[PDB]
Design a binder for this molecule. Sequence first.
Ligand SMILES: CCCCCCCC/C=C/CCCCCCCC(=O)O
Ligand SMILES: CCCCCCCC/C=C/CCCCCCCC(=O)O
Ligand SMILES: CCCCCCCC/C=C/CCCCCCCC(=O)O
Ligand SMILES: CCCCCCCC/C=C\CCCCCCCC(=O)O
Ligand SMILES: CCCCCCCCCCCCCCCCCCCC
Lengths: 222, 222, 224
Amino acid sequence: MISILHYGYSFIMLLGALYFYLLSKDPKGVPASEYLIAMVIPLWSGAAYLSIALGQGLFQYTTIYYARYIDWVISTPLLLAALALTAMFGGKKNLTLLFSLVALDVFMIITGFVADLSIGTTKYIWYSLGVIALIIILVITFGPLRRIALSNGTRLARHYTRVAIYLSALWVCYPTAWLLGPSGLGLAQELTEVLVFIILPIFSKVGFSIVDLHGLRKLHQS
Amino acid sequence: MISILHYGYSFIMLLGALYFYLLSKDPKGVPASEYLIAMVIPLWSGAAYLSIALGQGLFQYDTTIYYARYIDWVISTPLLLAALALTAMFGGKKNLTLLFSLVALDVFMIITGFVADLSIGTTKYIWYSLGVIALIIILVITFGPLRRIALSNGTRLARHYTRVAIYLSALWVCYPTAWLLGPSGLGLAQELTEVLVFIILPIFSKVGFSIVDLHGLRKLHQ
Amino acid sequence: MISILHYGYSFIMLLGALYFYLLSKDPKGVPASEYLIAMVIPLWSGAAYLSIALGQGLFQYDDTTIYYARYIDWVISTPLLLAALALTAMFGGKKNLTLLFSLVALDVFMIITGFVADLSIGTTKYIWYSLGVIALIIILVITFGPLRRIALSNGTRLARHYTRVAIYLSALWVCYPTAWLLGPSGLGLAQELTEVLVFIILPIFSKVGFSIVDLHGLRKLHQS
Ligand SMILES: CCCCCCCC/C=C/CCCCCCCC(=O)O
Ligand SMILES: CCCCCCCC/C=C/CCCCCCCC(=O)O
Ligand SMILES: CCCCCCCC/C=C/CCCCCCCC(=O)O
Ligand SMILES: CCCCCCCC/C=C\CCCCCCCC(=O)O
Ligand SMILES: CCCCCCCCCCCCCCCCCCCC
């Protein structure tokens, strides 16, 4: 079942990527960079999850789905970049703030991988550092990054706030699932975790960019 | 013989790099960034191939994986594409989105090759196939939108770009052909043959390309 | 012993990072990017050294201990330190990102040669070490050559500051490969504990010390 679920995921990623490419052909005031980001996220996640489908992106230590971390270390920082560019739409870009988020995010995923490879107190030290990174990301998202959004007008700010809440809601789910699942306290069955890390990603990897791009495109007056 | 061939390669890379450094001292209208790219490519490939020469950059899997090649290509090949892209954009506005589109496709391509090499049966050829699809999309961009940018920068620049585009594209298709025929693929070609092919081709791609490229661009100065 | 030393280091890194964050809140004409760089360096080094403290960032090889977490640290921290130095030279002027990424490239290569050298034995080890030393020399030539000339182009006061931080960092730079060569990774003249202490103390001066000197000097140039 696990194999089939991952094959299906990879196919949905491919479909999402194609949709964003088609949108890119009639961009409606949205820079090409934002379409490229939107496309890379699902395509990369697709490849990683395909490796799991083929029975390659995991090993025994319990089952460590290391392919997930290879996925997130690229996809999650790109998702943050997309959100940041949305905040900066119609204004001057703050790449310092953007790369601040990328750095925090990459560290977050790495702590997760190390934590998964760790046992006892060591595991939860790394997990904890990752959670601290996530909190700082959330503070930036609803603090200085939102103030940039507000500096770019009512309509843009309204869209940013919507996508910020969307992504933030999914963000908190991942570390919650991790902790409850076999990687953490082991309260949740492996199959449950597998389904959670199939469904969430669909909403984060494709869902987010659909909401984001449509909202931005709507700001265009042709 | 394999060790000696790699030592010789590394020496040629060193010579090529030094030549490009000398050219950089009297740049003739070519930005410093394009000389830096030209220098990093051979120097990086040189180091990687030196590791093989020393008997480090390979392991047994029951064939020999020259993993040092993938370490080389994951850096050298995206830089080669960047160089080609900047050539197209010479004298005009740069499209970094298109450039990083090519880098992304290229890095993915090399990774699929590494995974394919570590894979067996149908799994190997799935990854190989994904890499081939990336290469095709790179070729479509190179002779499509990227060439149209070249054409927008004048007849003389376009003529040069088309020349270097065909040069690199010719070498590009050789690598996946050799891979498939050689021990990593169908195993029709002898290991020594593959070793020689992945010594000779790189010399034309890592040094040859930049010689042709830089000379052509420098010639546009007068 | 070794574990406790690394825990202490990680705490000092955290304190340094917090200090730079506080400075960033009242920037005094120093761009945000330079505060971000100043913060990432110690935070990253802290995390890496914490892994050693926990007994994860090291393994046995050649019957000796490879502290591989050091290389994970340096491959990120050392290029950021060079970027910081380069941006200092370019303070008040046009950026030369080509020169900057030239230094990053040389630096990343340098650290990698060190890792490979540490995994190597006999003549192979010292070939890699040698390639790393050549990279360091080219970095020093750039630092006191073209990069200093950029500093000079940005006025007497900035140039004076750059020269000071350039000498500071360059002095620490030569120490690392000297310690490596003398320690178990090289000739094995120095005991493991001696090397461990050197690669605890130097980093404190490089990862925190440098940015304290650098940021204070730059902030001083601010008129208000
Ligand atoms: C250990 C591996 C870590 C790799 C991390 C990779 C992170 C990739 C993310 C990059 C995001 C950069 C986006 C920049 C957008 C450009 C701004 C613009 O379009 O004007
Ligand atoms: C693991 C894979 C990582 C690949 C990294 C290799 C780097 C390839 C990227 C090169 C981009 C170069 C862009 C140069 C822009 C020049 C603009 C200018 O001259 O003003
Ligand atoms: C092995 C992976 C190594 C990757 C290196 C990571 C760090 C590289 C450092 C880059 C610093 C970039 C600084 C750019 C300066 C811009 C300043 C400005 O314009 O405001
Ligand atoms: C494995 C990766 C670990 C973390 C590395 C993080 C790298 C990025 C961090 C800092 C560099 C910031 C440089 C960007 C500033 C751009 C300024 C501008 O031009 O507006
Ligand atoms: C602002 C709204 C935030 C979310 C937007 C998109 C909707 C996401 C809803 C979450 C999807 C379900 C995730 C959990 C799946 C658990 C399945 C358990 C099966 C055993």
